[PDB]
Amino acid sequence: GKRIGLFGGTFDPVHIGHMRSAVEMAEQFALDELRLLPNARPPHRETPQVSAAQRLAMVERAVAGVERLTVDPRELQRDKPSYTIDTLESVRAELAADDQLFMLIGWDAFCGLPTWHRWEALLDHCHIVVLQRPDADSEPPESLRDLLAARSVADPQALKGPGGQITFVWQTPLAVSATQIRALLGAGRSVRFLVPDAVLNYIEAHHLYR
């Protein structure tokens, strides 16, 4: 059907590390579309004076004019956060049944997957692609050996069908951090070139991260 990616993050703010990983994810999987999915979180876990809807605008500024990168605001429009599985069915509810869905997660995040609500069902709806990288020691928890055993493919090209498997991918993400960027901004410095230019212009224009 279509090759559709899903890239979830808090994005506070969205920066070139995310965007450059997005770019690479797509090109590797020949995605028709890669969807950035800003997650929703309790109001009190937002950066003070940076709202959900501003996080969402920057993500929009960042993919505007960018082919095949779009934004999915559905978590960002609920009554409160959701579990991922819930996002997944909602996404899938609007898909064609042969469309292939690829959820991109980080190694460290994948390592805590058995704590996600109803985790056993996630691969019902998508493929999970796990970012491997120089900083997260590839030592899977014993709680994930049987899952990786039943559903992982060593070749990403071998992901098949609209979902059901796990593969691993290697990237060297830029040494850009949203935490570093906030501090630079708090310190009054220039994060120019550490974030997409349309994101830079938004941060500046709206005097965000103070």
Ligand X SMILES: Nc1ncnc2c1ncn2[C@@H]1O[C@H](COP(=O)(O)OP(=O)(O)OP(=O)(O)O)[C@@H](O)[C@H]1O
Q: Which is nearer to ligand X, 27 or 150 (CB)?
A: 27
- With CB under 6 A as the contact rule, the residue among 3, 5, 21, 102 that binds ligand X is 21
Spell out, one character per residue from 99 to 138, where the chain touches ligand X: x when CB under 6 A holds, - when not.
-------x--------------------------------
Place of tokens 């869905």: 101
CB of 11 or CB of 98, closer to ligand X = 11
**3-state class of 151 per DSSP?**
helix
Cα of 74 vs its chain's centroid, Å: 14
Which run of H or of E encompasses 166?
A: strand 166-170
Does residue 18 belong to the site contacting ligand X (CB under 6 A)? yes
Contact call for residue 163 and ligand X (CB under 6 A) = no
Quote the CA–CA distance of 111 and 105 in Å, as a whole number: 10
Single residue of 93, 179, 187, 188 touching ligand X by CB under 6 A: 179
According to the binding rule CB under 6 A, does residue 75 interact with ligand X? Answer: no
- The stretch near ligand X (CB under 6 A) out of 9-17, 83-91, 119-127, 202-210 is 9-17
- In the complex with ligand X, which residue's Cβ is closer, 73 or 173? 173
CB of 119 to ligand X, least distance (A): 18
Q: Is residue 169 at the binding interface for ligand X, with CB under 6 A as the rule? A: no
Note if the bond before 13 is cis, omega within 30 degrees.
yes
Partners of residue 106 on adjacent β-strands: 131
35 is a site residue for ligand X (CB under 6 A): no
Nearest to 33 by CA among 79, 80, 1, 74: 1
Stretch that binds ligand X, among 7-15, 88-96, 120-128, 145-153 (CB under 6 A): 7-15
* Region binding ligand X by CB under 6 A among candidate stretches 11-19, 27-35, 62-70, 81-89: 11-19
Nearest to 1, CA basis, from 126, 168, 129, 167: 126
Cβ neighbours of residue 112 closer than 8 Å, sequence gap 6 or more: none
Answer for which of 85, 136, 176, 198 binds ligand X (CB under 6 A) is 176
What is the distance of C-alpha 62 from the center of its chain?
14
Please count the helices (runs of H) and the strands (runs of E) in the chain: 8, 6
Interface contacts to ligand X, rule CB under 6 A: 8-12, 17-18, 21, 106, 173-174, 176-179
